[PDB]
Structure formats: structure tokens, C-alpha cells
Ligand binder design. Structure first.
Ligand SMILES: Nc1ncnc2c1ncn2[C@@H]1O[C@H](COP(=O)(O)OP(=O)(O)OP(=O)(O)O)[C@@H](O)[C@H]1O
Ligand SMILES: Nc1ncnc2c1ncn2[C@@H]1O[C@H](COP(=O)(O)OP(=O)(O)O)[C@@H](O)[C@H]1O
Ligand SMILES: Nc1ncnc2c1ncn2[C@@H]1O[C@H](COP(=O)(O)OP(=O)(O)O)[C@@H](O)[C@H]1O
Lengths: 370, 370, 75, 370
């Protein structure tokens, strides 16, 4: 069917939907299911037992937040079906899923059962004309408009580094670590309890993510800022109460660059970028250092590019040009890539038709992926 | 009275010369704890080694000191040798002379620094480095024939005819047990079961040793794996959780025979064994086909010998008879050779003494290596 | 610019690019060997009027009829 | 014929092509077929599965290198067809093969089946008017403009010495040895692994060839320079990392003079030259010793002329005048000879016509070549 394809980013934190024609995603809402915290027997309470996106944000304190997708993998599929149904609601897009074809953006090196079940839902529950699963990293390059480039895509659920040179992705050089934005939000809650402010509730976890997003700066030297006495910058909560964050502000997102501090066995965001380049062939190393692209929401931390440049330089070889080319629209970069890809006439060949999936089998989605 | 100490990348096999099997066999690893700023409890060792670190895997970050038969961290290797002599063997290094094993075509600094420690740190009376492949022949009571000694660190092919080695015919391949263990993690992550940490990698090695087997026809085995669930076997983890690895069982050891899977762009363990025989003199080829030995624990995969014979026979001429030598004790084939060598009265002269080391230096080892 | 002004979660007053500071035959001069200057125009003139006799030519390992010498004479 | 005949010097390392009359070859590119080893995911990436010459040199890291001809013998003909096709393509000379006659330059004492297939391809696949196969040595003499001389042509693939007196070349005094520039690069890689820097990849093998050309000197005394402690001269790799070459710098190129090092029972480059002269009749020995012409790229080693003049003098008779003459363009000397031969009217009689080849077959090519 010729009618405009619907791009949808499967972001663990925020799913971004919209049409391929639009330069930006019109409808982007948080990826969580909202049910009433108190188990509702009585009338005059929150009805439906389902609150998604803007409806949830309004009555947030009353509801109990449960993320359906963890570490770029779908844990509860029933929840994810309701989320994708809300994408084709009167609230967002307001269209038939049966008419328009779909593009998914699954993280690299995900389970094959995750891709197979994702297709089954979108072909059976929704009567889609055609579906195409793609890598988040490959899209990010289409948006910026360069063929060569390493893509350090720091999402909410997973942070992954994929090196692609002249439209060729080395699949062995891909690096994936689970320590992402959501873990930084979890570790900030621990340090906020060490400052003396508890956020025990699942609703109260959402305002820790807001505190992180508002006020958390990455110091170039962490040891100097610790010895220096903090200003203790006040943050205002939804109720109106003030909280002085203090040293927790800067030593929370540090755990990205040094995850051994809390006690998580991972490489680190500076390390995975360098290791991904060093794993690739010697001839390409210089060009891959010379073309680095930051993607996702967990790069927007104040002074992230400043710290990463410094942490990469000392690990990388001496007298090598390191350009970390961040776009202005890092959060919405992954979708814009899909929107451009979808618009091209080549995409018509790439996607798998509904009749193709019935005849060919299950492999059809996997083999056409690349 | 003399000590044989195999310095394998996977496992360190140590024991007394003359004995049938090695006394102490432990995994060659150093376990440093994921410590926070919180104070630690009592009975705390700063760095654990071997069977102790194998018991306390959960918290300790497992760091293999020897990578591809090259000692990367010498301070770590020193702590293993200290655990080998004093604790495991219960013997003074000053009393007994120590035989060590190095893989062929290793860096010259490795053999140099190895002996320097044995002479200075441990104060050994005599020290001789030997090629692992040269020892492995003595195990089978065969002077003539090639060996395919595939270890955890490296795999090497050393052709030796009538007690005379062909140095230029020796070929080294970096593909080994640890690369297969790393490969098995990736394909298990594709199934669903994610293993990231250093402790988890050790559990994946236990899965590999028990279940994984070499297929005769890979394409035929993949067809049976797709249709029937007969090859699918269950394994219980340290946790009560059980996993069904399926087709990935026989997919892991395939990487040996076709490195393209791992993405090394090199010849297979079958093809390198053929290439090594062809590099040798035309006359002696006959005996090398007739006496092809498989050594190390990477040749204890069920049915590697059958697959090896098939692949060599196809490459080799039709008239030639290809017999693969697979003794029951392949894991301890390097050590048992060392025990036979050290015991022989002829070898008494070949030892490098302290007096010889003191006058000449550590460079003397390169002359009296092989 | 007006596209990214519409969206909420966008980087404002941040540098787009984080980059490092931009940093700015031995045998052919030997005594042993005698260095000759190759002039093909001069060489072409010397061989210009030289011909070869391809009549009864056979360089191959053919035994028949004694020894042979390819390229008999010119003109 | 009015259309100029194309000279193609089919060299093992570098194939040099151009039109007859031209003073230097306009289009000289490396002799290898580059195929992409990494997977293509993105749209707009580099088109084609075959990369040859300058496009392959730029994107070397992406591609897996594969040399078609080894030791002056075309191993894969499909690949040899694609490189000769690339010579006639738009990137290089950009003309039709049917309009221009060809001059091919093979090494002396190569297999007869090679010359037969070389002709078959150049007459059938390309409908060329005329093909003449010639020796490398005979051309090198036309370039220097000398009738008498022995031509020691040390190429990438093969090193050969052809004694030629007053136009006639003595076919029984021709001396050829497989050991050449590419075996020195292969022997250098082996010693770089002993120093502790690995270059396993086919792309990384081209960096070993670059290290050889830049930093390798032939010592005047081999046993003297072995004992003395050498200055560890650092070399900068493409990525930026520094390697200390040390003793491997001067030990590697000695292979040409001593083939026992790699372990081949053949004559040294110094032995080849004197044997070629000593095999020639008594009268001409003094004139051939006086007129020595070095050719090929593997003579450009620092202190080659100095060492050879020392080694030849010991083997040669006492009180004989030994003058070794080097044309400044050693690498391109073979081709320039081809251009001068091609420009002469005598070359018209020398050619094998299509009709002449079609009638007699393989015999016609063997009859007219030397
Ligand atoms: N029965 C088995 N089946 C399959 N793989 C095995 C088996 N036993 C061990 N392995 C694997 O092969 C490796 C064998 O190591 P081994 O005990 O031979 O020591 P090593 O370090 O390789 O010593 P060396 O290089 O001297 O042979 C193990 O690390 C493991 O990954
Ligand atoms: N302006 C910001 N400053 C700091 N962190 C941010 C900012 N915006 C988003 N984040 C973090 O990044 C997450 C968004 O990740 P996102 O880019 O949507 O991932 P994905 O690429 O998987 O869709 C948020 O949940 C939050 O943790
Ligand atoms: N400067 C140099 N120093 C040493 N060796 C060199 C140098 N330049 C080229 N070579 C060697 O010579 C080879 C070139 O051989 P070449 O003369 O082109 O072959 P042919 O004579 O068969 O056409 C290169 O591949 C390299 O091994």
C-alpha cells in the first residue's frame, strides 16, 4: 500500500511515533503503563485500570508506574500491546494500523525471540501491510547524513557502540552494555537517600528521573569537585517542597564512565566507544576516531562531550584526531533517521509483506533485517 | 627430583617429575573483589587465586593473566606461581628445578621475562622452557608425526619427524577455547539467556565442556536441529534456573573448523593442519598423515577426531591413509610428556643452571630453548 | 532551527562538535651502484632501424632438426 | 596498426599499464582483488563486491585482500581476468581491448600452462588484435639502452638473473628462485610476532609490506650486526600506535641472501647472479661481470648494492672488474623497456595475430615467445 509509512522508535524510556513525511516526531510519550496504586474495588476512583502517556502524567501520584521494556528487551508483552494500541489511538496519530506500513527500531544484539514476537503481534493483533525491524545505530547516521561513523547510542535501557564505515557495519566490533540512563536514575535514588530524601514509590521513581534530567552535570575531574564545597542547588518537587541535591548531583551520572564504583562489572561509556574502534581493522581506526556520533537521551548530560573527549583521548593513541559530532536533536535522532529511510523508494524492497510472512515462515523477518 | 609446571592460558597443570598425572590442576585466574568504600568483613584475602577464586566467583572479577599464550600481567602470573609451589604442590622452589611450557612462535620477551622471575624471585636451581607440542608426542610413545595441540589460549601445529622438528612448517592460530567460550555467549544471548560478567563467562565454559559436540556434516545437523528437538539438551546453572541451548550446542565448536563464524578471516583447525604438512618436505608427509595427534582440552570435544579425519582426507590425496591419534588423557597430554622428559637421565644436561644464567644473562634461554 | 525549537528535550546553548586541537631513496643515493638516467627517446632512436627475421622461428622445446636461434637477421 | 599497442607489466606485487611511446607508465596500481569482509546494512554504501587498485587502497580496512598470482604463477585466473578487465575500465587507460594490441611481461622459466591460459584469456574474453609475451630481463636492457648485461630482477613474487650478451640471451644460463620481496614481508611478519606485535589480518599484512619498504636496511656484515645491541627505531602505524622493530629490521631482508632462514634449500640472490655468469661460456664471463643491471622493486632495500658488491666479489674470481649499474627508476625499468620495444616497427613482425593464434592454437604463442 502506497499510504505513508508509520515510523515508531522502541525506546525503553520514551517511544517516539509519527509519519515518515514529518521532519520531527509529532507524538512522543513515556513508555510505561499506569494502573491505580490502591487496588480499586469501589466506584469514584480511576476507571479502566490503564493510563498511558499524557493521561498518566496528569494523575501520576495516584497511579503505579510499570515499565514494560527493560534493557532493550520486552518482559511483559500484554503491556507492550496496549502501548502500541495507544500509538494508534484518538490521542496520538488517529489512524488505522491496517492501512499504513510500520518500521520498528530494536537495539543491536537483542534476543531473536524478542524480534519474532514483535513481528507476530504487529502482523496478527494489528493487520499491518508490511513490517521492517532495523538497528537504532544505522538510522542515527541517515539523520546526520554521513555514511562512515561510529554511533555511541546511550538510551534509557541500553547503551551500545556500533562502528559503520562507508555503509558497512562490522557485526563483531559491536559493543553492548546494560548500564544505561535507567541505571543512572536508580543509582541517583540511592545517593538521594544518602542525602536523606527517600523516593521509595514507583511514581516517586519518575521524579528522580526528572531531577536527573533537570540537574546533573558531569565534572571533567570528579576528585576536585568532591573536595570543593557544593552550592547545594534547590530543586522544586510537584507538591511544592524543595530538596538540596548537593554532591549527589555530579557523582550520580559518573557511574556511566566508571560503573565499578557502585559494583557493576561493565566496561564504561568511554571504554565501549574506544574498544569498538580498536576491535575494528587497523586501517579504519583513524577514520572511526575522526567520525564519532552521539545518539540517545543519556548523552545530553551537561559536559558529557567534554568528559568523553578527555576520557577517550588518554585511552586512544597519541596525536590522533578525535571528533565527537553530536547533533542538536540527539534524543529524536534515531526516529529522524527512520523517517528519512522510510521516505526512500529502496525501503519498498526492504520491508516484509503480510503474505510473505504467512508463506516464507518465521525466518522472513530475521533474514530481511540486514 | 624435579617439578613440571604447564603454564596453560585456561588451566595451570603442576606436579612432580616421574608421576603418572599432575598433582594439582586449578584454573589459571586471579580474583580481585568488586569492593566499594564500605568496610569489608573478616577472613579477607586481598587477591584470590585458582580453586579459591573459582569458589568465590560471584563477587570477584576474574582476570586471565595469560592471553593467547602471552603473559600480559606478570604481577598476576607471579601470584599464580606462588599459589602453585608453596600452597598447591607444598614444595620449596629453591630445592627442586622447575620445567615450564611456552607455546611455539610466542614473543621473545615472554620466554625472557618468564625465566628472569624463576631465577630471581623464586631462586630456582635450574630452569628449562619447552614447546608444548614437542612434549605432547612423548605421551603417545611416538617420536615421528605432527600434533594439533589446541589449547584455551592458542592452537599450534608442530611437525616432528624421527625426533627432528621442522621450525618453518610451524603455524600458530589465535582461535582457541576462550574465543569459542566468547562466541558461545553471543549465540546464547541471541537465544535469550544473557551472560555478560567475568563470573558468568566461567559458567558458560562449564556449559561448553559438558554439552557441546562436533557435527560430521554441519548443514545436515542444522536441518535436524530445525525439524526435531532431539539435539536440544537441558543444563542446570549454579542457580536453580535451567536452560535449553538447542542448536547452539554444535554451532560453538563449528567455529574451530570455519573461523568465518568468529570473523577472523583465517584457515580452520583442519586446513592449518593440512597446510603445515604441505609446508614440510614431500617424503616425510606420508608419516605426518599417518601420525596426526590431537592434544590439549580443545580436542576433547565429542567427535572432533571423526570430523578432523573427514576434512583432512578431502584436502589430502586419495591414496594416502589419514589416522588421527586421540588418547584418553588429551587434557593432561602436555604435562605427562613433561614428566617423561624430566625423568630421562639425558635431560639432566639440557637444564640451564643459575651459574649459566648469572654469567650470560636472561638471553641464554633463546640459545637453550629448543 | 525552528524544527528543534518545537521539541521539548533538545540541547540549548551547547557546542555541536567536541573535537581535539588540530595538530599540523637511501639506496638510490649509494656509492656501490652506478646511477644511470633512463631516456627512452634516446633509446628509441638507437633501436629505431633494427629489424628481426621471424621466418623459420621456433623458441619452443622442439627436438626435431638440431639447434635453432630465434630472430635470424634484419632487412 | 594506427592505434598504439598497450604495455601491461603483469607483476606479482604491482601491475603497471600504459600506452607505447609514453616515457613512464601513467596508471600503476597494486595487484590484488579486495572483497568486503564486513556486512552492508546502510543504503548509499560502496557499490560492488570487487574493489581493485586505488579504490581498494583508500578503503583497505573494510576489504579482505587476496593476491591472484604468487611466485610469478597465476593461482586464481577468475581474479586475474577481473584485474586485466579493470586496466581497460574507465578508472585507468579507458579504451576498448579490441582496438589496441597488447604486450604482456611474464617472468622467465614459468610453467607453459600459465603462458597458454594467459593467451586464451587475452584472445577469447578480450578480442585483442595481437599479443606478444616477453621476458622481464630482455626489456630492462632496452630501457637502459645497452646490448650486453646480466639483469638481476628481484620482483615481489620471483627473483631471476638472465645473462644477455650483444642481443642474444642464453636460455640454459637462466637462474630463477621463488624466494622474493613477498617472502621477506611474510618473514618480517613472523619476526614482528616474535617482537610481540600481531598482524594476522590480510589488510594488516599490507601494513607489514609498508613497514618493510620504509624501515629495513641490509647490513654489510651479518654476524657483526647480530651481536651489537641495535637502536630500537619506532614506526607509526596507520591508527597512531608506535612499534619498536629492533633486530627484525635488518634480519628480515637477509632472507634474499640466505634462503636457509625461512628453511628453503635454494641459492641466495648473490649466488644466483654469480652462478648465471659462471654457467655462461668462459669468454663472456668478464663482460657479464662488468655489465650487471639490477631491476625490480626488491633491489631498492637500503645497502642492497653495497652488500651484493661485497658478496659477489668473494664468490667471483680474483682481480675481475665488478660494476653493478642501477637505473634510477628500478621499479618501472621493466615497463619502459616494453614501451621502447612496442614503439619499434620490428614489433609488428614479432606479434601473434588473432587468425595466427586461432589456426595453430597454443603452439603459436610458445613458438614466438622466448
Ligand atoms: N571435555 C572438554 N570438551 C570441550 N572443551 C573442553 C573440555 N575440557 C576443556 N575444554 C575447553 O578447552 C580448554 C582446555 O584447556 P586445558 O585444560 O587443555 O589447558 P590449556 O590452558 O589449554 O593448556 P595447554 O595450552 O598447555 O594445552 C578449557 O579451557 C575449556 O575451554
Ligand atoms: N535533557 C536530558 N538530560 C539528561 N538526561 C536526559 C535528557 N533527556 C533524556 N534524558 C535521559 O535519557 C532517557 C531518554 O532515552 P532515549 O533517547 O529516549 O532512548 P532511546 O534511544 O532508546 O529511545 C531519559 O529517560 C533520561 O534518562
Ligand atoms: N622502497 C622499497 N624498499 C624495499 N622493497 C621495496 C620498495 N618498494 C617496493 N619494494 C618491494 O618491491 C615490490 C615491487 O615489485 P615490482 O618490482 O613492482 O615487481 P615486478 O618486477 O614483478 O613487476 C613491492 O611489493 C615490495 O615488496
Amino acid at each position: 500500500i502506497a499510504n505513508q509509512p508509520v515510523v515508531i522508535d522502541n525506546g525503553s524510556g520514551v517511544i517516539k511515533a509519527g509519519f515518515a513525511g514529518d521532519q520531527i516526531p509529532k507524538y512522543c510519550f513515556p513508555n510505561y503503563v499506569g494502573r491505580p496504586k490502591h487496588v480499586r474495588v469501589m466506584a469514584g476512583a480511576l476507571e479502566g485500570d490503564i493510563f498511558i502517556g499524557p493521561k498518566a502524567e496528569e494523575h501520576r501520584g495516584l497511579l503505579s508506574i510499570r515499565y514494560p521494556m527493560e534493557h532493550g528487551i520486552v518482559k511483559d508483552w500484554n503491556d507492550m500491546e496496549r502501548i502500541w494500541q495507544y500509538v494508534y489511538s484518538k490521542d496520538q496519530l488517529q489512524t488505522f494500523s491496517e492501512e499504513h506500513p510500520v518500521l520498528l527500531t530494536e537495539a543491536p544484539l537483542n534476543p531473536r525471540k524478542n524480534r519474532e514476537r514483535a513481528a507476530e503481534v504487529f502482523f496478527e493483533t494489528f493487520n499491518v501491510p508490511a513490517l521492517f525491524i532495523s538497528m537504532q545505530a544505522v538510522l542515527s547516521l541517515y539523520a546526520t547524513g554521513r555514511t562512515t561513523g561510529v554511533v555511541l547510542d546511550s538510551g534509557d535501557g541500553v547503551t551500545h557502540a556500533v562502528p559503520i564505515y562507508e555503509g558497512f557495519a562490522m557485526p563483531h566490533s559491536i559493543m553492548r552494555i546494560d548500564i544505561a540512563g535507567r541505571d543512572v536514575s536508580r543509582f541517583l535514588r540511592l545517593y538521594l537517600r544518602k542525602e536523606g530524601y527517600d523516593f521509595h514509590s514507583s511514581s516517586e521513581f519518575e521524579i528522580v528521573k526528572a531531577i536527573k534530567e533537570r540537574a546533573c552535570y558531569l565534572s571533567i575531574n570528579p576528585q576536585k569537585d568532591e573536595t570543593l564545597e557544593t552550592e547545594k542547588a534547590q530543586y522544586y518537587l510537584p507538591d511544592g517542597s524543595t530538596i538540596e541535591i548537593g554532591p549527589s548531583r555530579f557523582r550520580a551520572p559518573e557511574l556511566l564512565f566508571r560503573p565499578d564504583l557502585i559494583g557493576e562489572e561493565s566496561e564504561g561509556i568511554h571504554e565501549v566507544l574506544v574498544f569498538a574502534i580498536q576491535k575494528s581493522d587497523m586501517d579504519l581506526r583513524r577514520t572511526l576516531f575522526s567520525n564519532i556520533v552521539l545518539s540517545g537521551g543519556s548523552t545530553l548530560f551537561k559536559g558529557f562531550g567534554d568528559r568523553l573527549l578527555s576520557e577517550v583521548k588518554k585511552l586512544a593513541p597519541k596525536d590522533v584526531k578525535i571528533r565527537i559530532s553530536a547533533p542538536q536533536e540527539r534524543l529524536y535522532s534515531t526516529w529522524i533517521g527512520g523517517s528519512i529511510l522510510a521516505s526512500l523508494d529502496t525501503f519498498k524492497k526492504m520491508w516484509v509483506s503480510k503474505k510473505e510472512y504467512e508463506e516464507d515462515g518465521a525466518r522472513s523477518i530475521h533474514r530481511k533485517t540486514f | 627430583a624435579a617439578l613440571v609446571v604447564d603454564n596453560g592460558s585456561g588451566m595451570c597443570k603442576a606436579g612432580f617429575a616421574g608421576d603418572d598425572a599432575p598433582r594439582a590442576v586449578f584454573p589459571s585466574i586471579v580474583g580481585r573483589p568488586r569492593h566499594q568504600g564500605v568496610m569489608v568483613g573478616m577472613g579477607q584475602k586481598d587477591s584470590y587465586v585458582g580453586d579459591e577464586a573459582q569458589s568465590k566467583r560471584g563477587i570477584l572479577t576474574l582476570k586471565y593473566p595469560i592471553e593467547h599464550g602471552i603473559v600480559t600481567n606478570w604481577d598476576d602470573m607471579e601470584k599464580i606461581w606462588h599459589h602453585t609451589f608453596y600452597n598447591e604442590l607444598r614444595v620449596a622452589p629453591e630445592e627442586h628445578p622447575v620445567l615450564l611450557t611456552e607455546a611455539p612462535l610466542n614473543p621473545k620477551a615472554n620466554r625472557e621475562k618468564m625465566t628472569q622471575i624463576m631465577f630471581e624471585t623464586f631462586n630456582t636451581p635450574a630452569m628449562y622452557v619447552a614447546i608444548q607440542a614437542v612434549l605432547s608426542l612423548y605421551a603417545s610413545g611416538r617420536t615421528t608425526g605432527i600434533v594439533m595441540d589446541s589449547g584455551d589460549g592458542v592452537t599450534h601445529t608442530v611437525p616432528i619427524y624421527e625426533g627432528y622438528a621442522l621450525p618453518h612448517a610451524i603455524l600458530r592460530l589465535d582461535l582457541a577455547g576462550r574465543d569459542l567460550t566468547d562466541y558461545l555467549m553471543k549465540i546464547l544471548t541471541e537465544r535469550g539467556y544473557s551472560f555478560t560478567t567475568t563470573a558468568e563467562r566461567e559458567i558458560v565454559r562449564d556449559i561448553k565442556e559438558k554439552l557441546c559436540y562436533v557435527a560430521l556434516d554441519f548443514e545436515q545437523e542444522m536441518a535436524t536441529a530445525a525439524s526435531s528437538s532431539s539435539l536440544e539438551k537441558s543444563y542446570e546453572l549454579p542457580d536453580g534456573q535451567v536452560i535449553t541451548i538447542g542448536n547452539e550446542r554444535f554451532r560453538c565448536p563449528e567455529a574451530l573448523f570455519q573461523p568465518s563464524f568468529l570473523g577472523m578471516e583465517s584457515c580452520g583447525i583442519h586446513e592449518t593442519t593440512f597446510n603445515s604438512i604441505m609446508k614440510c618436505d614431500v617424503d616425510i608427509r606420508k608419516d605426518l598423515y599417518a601420525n596426526t595427534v590431537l592434544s590439549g582440552g580443545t580436542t576433547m570435544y565429542p567427535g572432533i577426531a571423526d570430523r578432523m579425519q573427514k576434512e583432512i582426507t578431502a584436502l589430502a590425496p586419495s591414496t594416502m591413509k589419514i589416522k588421527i591419534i586421540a588418547p584418553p588423557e588429551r587434557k593432561y597430554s602436555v604435562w605427562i610428556g613433561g614428566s617423561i622428559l624430566a625423568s630421562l637421565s639425558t635431560f639432566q644436561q639440557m637444564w640451564i643452571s643459575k651459574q649459566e644464567y648469572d654469567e650470560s644473562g636472561p638471553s641464554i634461554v633463546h640459545r637453550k630453548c629448543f | 532551527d525552528p524544527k528543534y525549537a518545537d521539541l521539548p528535550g533538545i540541547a540549548r546553548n551547547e557546542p555541536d562538535v567536541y573535537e581535539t586541537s588540530d595538530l599540523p631513496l637511501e639506496e638510490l643515493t649509494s656509492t656501490s651502484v652506478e646511477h644511470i638516467i633512463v631516456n627512452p627517446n634516446a633509446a628509441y632512436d638507437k633501436f629505431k632501424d633494427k629489424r628481426v627475421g621471424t621466418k623459420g622461428l621456433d623458441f619452443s622445446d622442439r627436438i626435431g632438426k638440431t639447434k635453432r636461434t630465434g630472430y635470424e637477421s634484419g632487412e
